[PDB]
Design a protein around this ligand. Structure first.
Ligand code: NAG
Ligand code: URC
Length: 515
């Protein structure tokens, strides 16, 4: 096939502009996923209480600190209880002779009158709007799980639709669905409706993710294809910085969600000026359309050959593909072949670990460091050099040691985060950033390495199964935080154990760089 790209220009003005255009979309698409660090931030809260909040009642000369001690009991964390209040004001607790033994839990009641939230950092969040606290506290990670499950279902449905209707058409309606569903989520009236719209937004996120990469690869000559995949992967790196930059300015969740959604109307509008994949149009037996959209690109790249492209040349240049690209093999074949079964197991585990660890940690920055805006920005800034170093070492040291070393870097940093005491917040934050950097490097590493461990007929099958495994791991990511009742160390130990085991496992793979 690529002989045609050499008539049309296989790297040039069109591929440059297409890479820029799709990278920008991937940036905003990354903001959509990272948003719920900020849209769903948990502000500090307490029960509403008469002496503190009933401004219509008779006031007193006591200070707010004293009235808080008189109204809200202390909780386990040596801070005011987030889910209880005194049944009657505890005037007895003001005198210096008082002790903690002076009251008992029967003297307290739950927040009958609802909660009061700290508005200093964020003006509003979904947690503050729908009271996703105390007995409802599980509902935040449930919302994140529903989003990531939406992406799983969307990726499962994308394949058949992408193959039947085309890369660009599905990408176009994915952009429209992202805009519409993000705008709808921004104005949802109730929590179930918000979950429905976030699910339907994720369903389109999957389509954008898959089709952008597929279309970039299908329009790029082979010498530049790894570089193009790397640039498309740096799109997310800049997406992290963009998330921090936008969320630092917009402190209301409705306005923030709307702001990050609206750009996709423009993405929808400019996607119509992209060409549908020529490989797809030829494979589906539509030469008259493939010729048009090839010489359209030849016009952009500035070639005289737009006069030379002709149907007979177009047909003669792709004689093999239409005659042989007819093997949509089932996933089970990977397990049927004795040799490939165990390689498939290990590579699928390496895909799983990325999603599990990354969307375990990256979606609760509030636990990792002092300032989530700056920490998100750093998760971008450190992701970039990690990815470039991954590409280079992947090109020199071999895929096996680079995959193993990246995953072991991630695991060791995330585990060490549990050894460093809570007082050393700076080192905890730095280790968390480095761990997410290692995971993000392994993302590129595995994307390329899994495309070599299997014979060329089953290469694509392995990559698809790996992607589904990463999505299954991402879904479990958020739910693992529900173990945190037993301690803050436990979710971190789990998230750190997974990459350690998978990184050790990657050592058992064969090397695929030339030896
Ligand atoms: C708040 O104060 C007003 C003052 O008139 C009173 O009528 C009302 O019952 C009070 N409510 C609570 C919950 O203290
Ligand atoms: O390096 C990444 N950063 C992300 O924020 C992200 N989100 C995603 O779905 N895949 C990736 N990869």
């Amino acid at each position: 096939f690529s002989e045609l790209l050499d008539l049309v220009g296989g790297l040039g003005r069109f591929q440059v502009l297409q890479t820029m255009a799709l990278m920008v979309s991937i940036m905003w698409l990354c903001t959509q996923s990272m948003l719920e660090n900020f849209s769903a931030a948990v502000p500090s809260h307490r029960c509403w209480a008469p002496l503190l909040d009933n401004s219509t009642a008779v006031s007193t000369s006591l200070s707010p600190e004293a009235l808080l001690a008189i109204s809200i009991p202390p909780g386990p964390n040596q801070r005011p209880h987030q889910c209880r209040r005194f049944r009657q004001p505890q005037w007895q607790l003001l005198d210096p002779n008082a002790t903690a033994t002076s009251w008992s839990e029967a003297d307290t009641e739950p927040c009958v009158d609802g909660w009061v939230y700290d508005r200093s950092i964020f003006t509003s969040t979904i947690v503050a709007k729908w009271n996703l606290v105390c007995d409802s506290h599980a509902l935040k990670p449930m919302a994140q799980s529903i989003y990531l499950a939406g992406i799983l279902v969307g990726a499962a449905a994308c394949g058949p639709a992408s193959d039947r209707f085309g890369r660009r058409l599905v990408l176009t309606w994915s952009y429209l669905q992202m805009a519409v569903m993000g705008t709808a989520a921004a104005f949802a009236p109730a929590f179930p409706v918000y979950c429905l719209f976030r699910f339907l937004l994720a369903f389109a996120v999957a389509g954008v993710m898959m089709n952008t990469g597929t279309l970039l690869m299908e329009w790029t000559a082979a010498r530049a294809r790894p570089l193009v995949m790397t640039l498309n992967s740096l799109g997310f790196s800049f997406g992290h910085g963009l998330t921090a930059a936008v969320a630092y300015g917009v402190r209301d969740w409705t306005l923030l969600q709307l702001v990050v959604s609206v750009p996709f109307f423009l993405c929808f509008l400019y996607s119509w000026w992209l060409p549908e994949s020529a490989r797809w149009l030829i494979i589906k037996g539509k030469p008259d359309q493939a010729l048009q959209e090839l010489r359209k690109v030849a016009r952009i790249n500035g070639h005289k050959e737009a006069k030379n492209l002709t149907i007979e040349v177009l047909m003669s240049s792709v004689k093999e593909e239409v005659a042989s690209a007819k093997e949509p093999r089932s996933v089970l074949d990977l397990f049927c072949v004795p040799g490939l079964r165990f390689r498939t197991c290990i590579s699928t585990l390496c895909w799983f670990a990325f999603g599990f660890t990354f969307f375990g940690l990256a979606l609760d920055l509030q636990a990792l460091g002092s300032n989530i805006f700056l920490l998100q920005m750093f998760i971008g800034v450190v992701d970039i050099p990690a990815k470039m170093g991954a590409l280079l070492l992947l090109s020199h040291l071999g895929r096996r040691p680079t995959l193993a070393a990246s995953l072991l870097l991630a695991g060791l940093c995330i585990l060490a985060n549990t050894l460093v005491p809570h007082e050393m917040g700076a080192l905890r934050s730095a280790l968390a950033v480095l761990g997410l950097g290692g995971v993000g490097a392994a993302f590129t590493c595995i994307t390329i390495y899994s495309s070599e461990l299997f014979p060329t007929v089953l290469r694509m099958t392995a990559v698809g199964l790996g992607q589904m495994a990463a999505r299954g791991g991402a879904i479990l990511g958020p739910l693992v935080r529900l173990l945190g009742v037993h301690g803050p160390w436990l979710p971190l130990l789990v998230y750190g154990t997974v990459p350690v085991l998978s990184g050790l496992a990657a050592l058992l793979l064969p090397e695929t760089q030339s030896l």
